Each structure stands twice: as C-alpha cells, then as structure tokens.
Amino acid sequence: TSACENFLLPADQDGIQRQVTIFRYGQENSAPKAYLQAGLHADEFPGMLALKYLRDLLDEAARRNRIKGEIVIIPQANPIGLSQWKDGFLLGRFDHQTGTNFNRDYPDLCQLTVEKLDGQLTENAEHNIDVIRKTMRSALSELKPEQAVDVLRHKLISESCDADLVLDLHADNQAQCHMYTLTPLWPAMHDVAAEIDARAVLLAEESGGHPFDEACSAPWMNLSRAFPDYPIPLACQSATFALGSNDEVDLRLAQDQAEALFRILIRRGFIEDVHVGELPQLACEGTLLEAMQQLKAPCQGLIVYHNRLGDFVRSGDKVVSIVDPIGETVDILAHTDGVLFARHSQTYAYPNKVIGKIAGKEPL
C-alpha cells in the first residue's frame, strides 16, 4: 500500500548521520505525480501533523485500491534542523554547519538543462515535458554535493522536479494560512488556494536566493523564454502553503488541512471513486509579493501591536509600536491598504526585524 525509503545524509560535525523518511503511495513513475513535503523549516509544525493525517487518509485510499498516480509524502523534510536545540528551544530555520537558510540555494534547473535541450525540443508539448523532465533528472545526477544540507536539498529537488503537483508546507511565526506561487501559475492554482483557505496569495517570478517552490516551477517559465520557438507549458505547478503559526499544533486543524490536501489530490486526478463537489470560496485575491509590506522594527524594544492578526489596515494607520521600557516609543505605520495576515510570536525586536506583513495591491 505504501513504500518507505530512509535516505541517509552524510555525517555532520559531530559524526552524526541523519535520515529523511519518504513515503510513496502510488505506482512508481506513474500517471500524474504529486509531491508534498513539510518541516523544511524544522520549527514549522502544522504541516508535519497535517501530512501525518493525510497519510491516514491515503492508507485507506490505498486499501480501497483508489490511488491513480504517484503521491510522495515527506512529513519531516529536514532532520538536520529538527536536531538543532539551543537552551531548550528548537532553531530549525538555519543550518548550524553552513549558516544557510534551509529553504534557499536550490539548483537552477534551467541553467542546468538549457545546453542539453538545444537539439531535443519539438512541436509536441507533451514530448517536450518528458524530454525536459528526463534532462532535469540527468542534470541533477551529474551534481555531487558533499555537505549534509546540500545533499538534503539535492535529494528533495531530485524527487520533486518531475512532479505535476508540488506542495511545500510551511508556517510563519504568527500568521493566517497563506500561499506563495509563481506569478503565471495564477489563477491556475486558484483551486488549491481555495481548498486550503489561503487569506493571502503572493505572486513572484523570481524571489530571494532560490527557494524550493520556485526551484520546482520557475524552470518551466525560464525554459519557455529560453526556447520561445517550442511549446513549453508550466508542467510543474508548485506552491508554498504557510498553514498557520509555527507552533500551531491542533488536531482539528491538522485533520481539516489533511482533508483539504486530499480534496486537492482528488480534483487533480490522484484519487478515484471520490466526489469533491463545489470549490470553496477563496477569501482573498492574488497579489504581487512586491506589493506586500514588511513591517520592520527601526530599533530594539517591546513589540506592541495595535492590530489583530487578520485585520484590514489602511495606509497611514498605526499598526505596531516599538517600546523601550527604559526609553522612547516609536510608532510604525502601514504604507499600503491590505490584510495584516502576519505578525510575530516573539514580542521583542532588533533593528530591521520583520514584525508583520500586509498583503497590498500597489507594488512597493
């Protein structure tokens, strides 16, 4: 019913080897392929519990012989970060050994495949998809990473680059459910945004230092541009789901998110003999990431919020203040109209700390 791989990473600075546990629910290399992972930031929990419950649903779908394609589930994509305790707190965002962000510095599969594809593309889009996916797998086989974190990033992209559907499950420090995707995959991924009840959908073609979701979807956009004489569709539809707050561990929520992910899999042809019915109403519009305001602390001090999580705020509104208990108070204003979909869990600032997010429409 379910295959299990334990992929072993090379030893860290303490001589410790870690494993990535990967579950597969379908026929290997079959039909449509889905990839779902959680816990790439090891201190972001909601996705971990949601995929535990999605597995319970898929075990039943497997027993009933209703799995159509290949579904790949990784509830804890980052066993390195998961071990990084300091003074009794888990710091799962950055790699101790390299200092790098776990959701950065993924391979650029356009840069790795453009030369190889020069003579292989044709007028048949489906053919180009198979050629590009095969080329991507070959290009990754040629890379030889040495550090556990680079080997981990390599494995995760090697197992996801040829998928039709990729969902990277994340969380923010204090936030409402929200989604990120590639600009041209909107509104294609309207259904997934609606099912997971995103309260913000943030669009970009190219963001920061090569995150996982863009590593999966961007290559199809960049290859389409590299080879404009050939049909290259956006074959891999990836998104990042921030499912809630980092510490939001709740049975009801995880079960509801597992059921939503199951409904997404049904709608996209991974499950048969199950009815989905009407798509839920999406509570927000897609906006550009560059139109999103990061609220930053201009100084150190207590973070005092004047708005609740999810409040609509307008340009000029006082949203948060930094209070020095032995000094001055500094007021921070909204510079755009939008929804305060994120704040922060730790209510003390250092200068340039991002302490909140407003999803607006006008680029900043």
Ligand X SMILES: N=C(N)NCCC[C@H](NC(=O)C[C@H](N)C(=O)O)C(=O)O
Query: Toward ligand X, which CB reaches closer, 131 or 201?
Result: 201
Query: Toward its own copies, which CB reaches closer, 120 or 147?
Result: 147
- Chain positions 24 to 43 lying near Zn ion, rule: CB under 5 A, are 41
Question: Which residue, among 5, 10, 4, 22, has the nearest Cα to 144 in the 3D structure?
Answer: 10
Residue 23's CB is within 10 A of a number of other CB atoms, namely 19
Q: How many chain residues touch its own copies (CB under 8 A)?
A: 62
Residues ≥6 apart with Cβ < 8 Å to 9:
17, 18, 19, 20, 79, 80, 148, 151, 152
- Residue 248 is a binding residue for ligand X (CB under 6 A): no
Between CA 119 and CA 19 the distance in angstroms is 39
- Residue 336 is a binding residue for ligand X (CB under 6 A): no
- Residue 153 is a binding residue for Zn ion (CB under 5 A): no
Query: Toward Mn ion, which CB reaches closer, 3 or 304?
Result: 304
Residue with tokens 């409904």: 263
- Chain positions 13 to 52 lying near its own copies, rule: CB under 8 A, are 21, 23, 38-39, 43, 45, 48-49, 51-52
CB of residue 161 vs its own copies: minimum separation in angstroms? 23
Residue numbers of the site for its own copies (CB under 8 A)? 21, 23, 38-39, 43, 45, 48-49, 51-52, 75-76, 85-91, 93-94, 199, 247-253, 255, 259, 275-279, 281, 283, 285, 302-308, 310-312, 314, 317, 323, 325-326, 337, 345-348, 350, 353, 363
Residue numbers of the site for Mn ion (CB under 5 A)? 304, 321
